[PDB]
């Protein structure tokens, strides 16, 4: 169908995000 | 511009030895891989357009270079971006050829950078597209060959970074 | 602020030929804020510090040093 | 522009501008004010330009819409009305600098090859671009009306 | 290589946004100065070599530099002395045309102190004679003319210097 | 590491490497198999080192995950939780080479000025350290634990 | 004052005060009773500024205040109060000093380091004075407190 | 080094003259924007470092250059990253108060472009650091102060590139 | 001016401007009014200024006019009440820019060298500048005199 | 500066003779407690800042000196205060690993009298600091390494009084 | 300046990723070959005096550069010739201690082109003094010793040249 | 840095040949004309600041450049001309005293063209400057101490020019 919005990224090596699942499981 | 065979001859003749049997032993390598690698040019020369705008598909459109602002923006810069990736699977089918990626930075990364920096090209968006370029040709052409593309394909995109 | 000290210095690294005297045994003005890192010089240089006066300083002052 | 090319055809000649060169300039100076009120025209009336335009678009051309067509699925239409609000602001600024070299040095020399790597008919685009042509000389006197479709008569044209 | 129009135009693409009145107010002033442009230009066609010259009589002539050891002593050097004045006021006269000084160090200004550091050209005394001619050309077309020809001078001495 | 301090000490002092630097490296090339082994045992154990040590932090410094704390909100914990990974990575490089120039000549020279300037109290960034090094001198011999904590000793005095 | 560093620079220059620095002394010997005013409606209501200026922080940045953070307890608070009490001090000394200098020589020296061994937050600080200086500004009129917000300012920039 | 006073001043010299009414209408002007630019450079020293943090915050923070392989990835790189930021707010401030950009090229923009080239650093990544950087100063000081902060921020970035 | 002294002395420092520099440039700022109308005085007067100021100073030193003197003779004199006309000038542009690095940095470094090496006697320059301020105080109300007469007192001062 | 080691040595050098055993004993003496030296050496190394800031908050905080009035008053005061104690503990840190307190009178008690007479420093409340900073790394470190940061802080205090 | 270890490190670091095989790999290669590198180190720290000679005694005495008009002529100029010898042995044994060759052209080979250029040093003779340098250490150390100093050796001479 | 003595020794030494007859009679002129040189070194010395001021006032003075845009026009410009005269003066009077005008493109003609030419330095003026300044010396010392002056007088302005 081709949906036009922005392709995802996977994230590179020592990324914010990386640590954030575990950001939201500790206290 | 060396292949395998003329690596081995050239490292054989600055020795200025014979051929011993670690060259032949080389030699019998590439004299096995030669016809994955004739098969996997004619399935890469097959689909050149549709690796190319796949992986524009994957990675460039709908993001923010393909917007206004972006390096990707214009019809001149979409048209020299199609054919910047052009070059990139050419070259890495040039280089899967031969066995022997001297013909990459001879011609490919040997102003590359510089080039770039001077133009405002994103490196690291440019590296992202030769990756899932990567991706699909490997997608393509079955898992060893895919993976014997994708060593020239990640040396172009280490020699890039 | 400034100090005044008297301090005698001597060559134990290497004989120096030339007369040293002025180097060896001397007394000088020394900024306060420079006494620190002057101090510590002497300490590393071996040297034994003699006579600390600081006339020129009024100590126990908050406001103009 | 009118002045860039100007400068840039006397400055191959290594001569200064002729004076035919620059009463074409100042007729075009002259011409400013006119060329700005098109400009206004085209650019306070673009939501219904940009939307009568895709719809008598996908009237006429309904397999680019229909499924198989490259513009499929709600996205693929509204995708594609970026692009014709893309050729309409080249259209403006075409309207502007009084020559076409704002279009064509922005969104005309490559078109074909890039929608040939996105699978793109281009006659349908020249479509696109004929009906929004229509829709704007719809909406102007008639002299602005010319002036304006010689623009869009140069993008038309240089689709095929 | 780029008018005012071209200069707005680019600022607005970049910023992706649509013309504002700010480049309306931009473009307007550029078009009521664009009549007093074209007949300033047309009078500076008019009188290129006398502008030339009157410059060289001006400053140049009759000192060292067109005695024995000058820079300007031969023929040759006379010659491309007279060259290069004339490529000054060309050039002064595409930039009052463009209402940009794009052109001055696209063109003119790109390798022009390198090439007259290596030749030994003197620059103070090629600067004197670029505002010696801004002077007589400021005397020719008037005052508003005059200056806004002799910004485009202050340009080219400015990147000189 | 060993060799490079080695090499730059007797090379400002214009000699050759001294026998006694010569045995030092030699040892050190010896005590590289448990080094490798200390930083297989820090590596494939992270998650859990992280982990444990970012909770224990927050259960000891509950004010910076407070509201008006740097680290308050998903993305600033997970922030938090990223910039402990960086020191257990530089401290398992520091491990390797035997010395602490990696960990100095990476991530302890400008990190006051740095943590200053994001609004980070940089006592917190020492007691998560202590925790990590709490779980992960939980985690080995006792040898090992001493020669890891040496490490882990180095980050926390540099801190402060 | 304005007359100490007038004086240092002559010095530091090795020459007489140049009749503009006597018209700057001159200026300020006008202006000492506008400063007079502006030091005396700060030391009137200086409990006021204190206890709204450390309630709008405690409110802005909860983390002094929180279990585990700087300023917990009774004596805390009153000892983070009482340092705001300096800062004020400070700031009514440099206001009636027409100079920033007797700020600098008590409070601004080495604040960074000493509250580094305390552990205090030094931009909790700067916000407290942000807050003192809104407050303080709030009280004035409106050219006194431009005055008054440069030392506040000034104070602010040298924290942060 | 010279505010708008000394360059007057310099030019009236340059040419003999004594200061006629266009240099007492140009220092007329510098004297009545002087007051709005005391109270920017107050408001500019306020917020120094937070200026300088929203600048990281909005450009360069969790981009690729913060990561590993990037030029402002170690501790060292982003102190000296804070370091040059920090330098070009604070010698804009300087510039706004003098109201000539001077400073700028004599203690900026001297060997900055070499340097920079030198050591690796992405001069596109640091303009628009100082285009952020300007950003933020402008929403903090207004629409005329931001503006004439954002004249030398411009220069500063024209000079880099 | 103020404005670069106060700029360069901020830069060395590697701080911004204080406030109180910030106000010292505010208060130039205001009155450059009255610098601008003293500069007037001073400017519109000048054949009176010198002329009377070389008459008084060959007056009260007639040995430099006599034969033997420096300034003996038609030109000399006239190049005497040259020199006097750049001291004036000077005058009036340290009287603007608000500070003497306008006077110091054209026409006061090497003035010894330069007298020294054309054969002048330097006091007599300085019973010169004493005429010329005598003619020009004379000349304005009080405190604008006393604002010049600062400028004039740096150059008698720079004399000797 | 002399170790144990370099104190055998120079004694049994003053009077010209050999190494006898009895310097030997010494000697390994000095090794068998060099090893918890460097152990506690290592522990102090790493906790300096926290042993420091419980030193001060033990004595030095609600007296009158870190109050007004006292010689710990103002920020550059407390600021070279917590630098007077720091220094302390480093030089006891030496001390302790050299087993010799040459170092402590050869660079802290050297000219430290006169210097604390001078600025007025009060020695009874830096010896109290002393003594506080004492028992802290003694709870901190051990027992047996405790005694021996124990004799070298009152080196310090014995050479302070 | 970095070894074996720490470019290795610095690779993983700057892809952001953890210590993979073909890095462990290379650790185990250099771990292998450290105990050959420390003997060939104290064996060319035994004899740095004699190979120099050795070198100068093979190529530069008795020819032209030691008579007069030599640049090895003086004795200032044959002391700082040793020096400079004794310097290239030094260096080469520290770049194969570790096993890489930043140290030379960080501080060897940095500015050696253009000082030697503009003393006048003749660059292929100290290349070929160096080339004897080298032979004569690869016959004092062995076959693969010899080798992996005259990498370095073939490094200095690269740079030089 | 050289004299007659030196530069004879140099080239008697760069033969390798001991002093012939060539060599002795050079030296027996310099050591016959040393005399002349001494005297005329002092008659110099007496009268360095007339000569100076001589010369500007042969040359320099009520011309151009010192009334208002000339490059002698302020009393620093005009403190430095003093001061570059001086020099020349000094310098010819080493090279008179040595005999060789090594010292003068060793210390005076070194960078001295590329100075001025940066400074916007006139060097027809200073070469008229030094002209007039041996024409005033010659005058002093007489004629043939007054040719032995001018010859490195006439050094100094062609290695200016
Ligand atoms: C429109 C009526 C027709 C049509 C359009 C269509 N366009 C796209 C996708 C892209 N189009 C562009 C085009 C331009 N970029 C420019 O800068 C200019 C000049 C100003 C032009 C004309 C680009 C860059 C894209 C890629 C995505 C992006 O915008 O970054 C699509 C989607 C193609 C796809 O594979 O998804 C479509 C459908 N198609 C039609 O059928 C109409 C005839
Ligand atoms: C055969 C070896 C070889 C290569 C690879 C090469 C590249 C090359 N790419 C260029 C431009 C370009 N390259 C790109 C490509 C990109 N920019 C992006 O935003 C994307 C991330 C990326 C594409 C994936 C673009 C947009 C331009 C045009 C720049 C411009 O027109 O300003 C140019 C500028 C001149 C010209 O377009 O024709 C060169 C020389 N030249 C060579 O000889
Ligand atoms: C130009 C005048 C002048 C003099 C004389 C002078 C002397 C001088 N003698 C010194 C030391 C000395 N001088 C002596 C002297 C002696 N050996 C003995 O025992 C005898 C009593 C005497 C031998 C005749 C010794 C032993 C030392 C070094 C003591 C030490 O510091 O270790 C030092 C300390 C630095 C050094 O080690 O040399 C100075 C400066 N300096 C001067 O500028
Ligand atoms: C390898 C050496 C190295 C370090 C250390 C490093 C730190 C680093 N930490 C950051 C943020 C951060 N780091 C923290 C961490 C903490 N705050 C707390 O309260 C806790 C005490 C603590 C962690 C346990 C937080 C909250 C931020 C976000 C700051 C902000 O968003 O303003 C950022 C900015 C965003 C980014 O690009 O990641 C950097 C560069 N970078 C490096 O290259
Ligand atoms: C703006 C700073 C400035 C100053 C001051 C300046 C002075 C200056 N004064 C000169 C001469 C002179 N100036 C004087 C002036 C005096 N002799 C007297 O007896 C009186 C006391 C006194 C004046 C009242 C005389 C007599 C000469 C001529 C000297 C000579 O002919 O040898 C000359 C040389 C001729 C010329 O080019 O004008 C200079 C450059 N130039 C400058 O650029
Ligand atoms: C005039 C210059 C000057 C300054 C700056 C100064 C600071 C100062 N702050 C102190 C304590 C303190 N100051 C704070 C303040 C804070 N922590 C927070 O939570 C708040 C955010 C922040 C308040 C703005 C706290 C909590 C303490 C007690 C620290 C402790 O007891 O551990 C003390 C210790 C008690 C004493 O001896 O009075 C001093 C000396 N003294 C001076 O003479
Ligand atoms: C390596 C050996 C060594 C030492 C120890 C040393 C000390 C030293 N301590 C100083 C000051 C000081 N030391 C203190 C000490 C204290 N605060 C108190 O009130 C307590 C009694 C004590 C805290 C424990 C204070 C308050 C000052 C600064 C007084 C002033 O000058 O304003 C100064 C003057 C310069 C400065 O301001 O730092 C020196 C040189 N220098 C050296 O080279
Ligand atoms: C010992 C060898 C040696 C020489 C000769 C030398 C010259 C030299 N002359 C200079 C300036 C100067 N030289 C002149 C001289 C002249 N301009 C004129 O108009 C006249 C024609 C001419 C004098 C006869 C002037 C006016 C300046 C100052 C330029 C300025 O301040 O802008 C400077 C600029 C820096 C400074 O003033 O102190 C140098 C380095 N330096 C040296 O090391």
Redesign the interface.
Known sequence: ?????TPDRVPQAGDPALFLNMARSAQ | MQDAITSVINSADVQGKYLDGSAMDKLKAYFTTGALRVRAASTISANA?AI??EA?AKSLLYSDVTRPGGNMY???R???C?RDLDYYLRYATYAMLAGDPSILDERVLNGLKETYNSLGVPVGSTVQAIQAMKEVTAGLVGADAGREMGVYFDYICSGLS | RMFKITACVPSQSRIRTQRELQNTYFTKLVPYDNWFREQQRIMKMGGKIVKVQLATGKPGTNTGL | ?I??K???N??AE?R????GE??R??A???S??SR?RI?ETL?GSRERIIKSAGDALFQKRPDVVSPGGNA??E??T??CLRDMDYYL?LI??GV??GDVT?IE???????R??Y????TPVDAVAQAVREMKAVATGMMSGDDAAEAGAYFDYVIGAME
Do not use: C, H, N, Q
């Open positions: 169908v081709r949906r036009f919005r | 357009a190319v705008k524009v214009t019809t001149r979409y048209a020299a199609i | 522009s002045v860039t100007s400068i840039v006397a400055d290594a200064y501008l002729s004076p620059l009463d300039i100042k075009f100076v002259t400013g004010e700005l400009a650019t499929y699925g996205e693929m509204a995708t602001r403006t600024y502007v600098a704002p040095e922005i969104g005309l020399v490559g078109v090859e890039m040939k790597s996105l699978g």
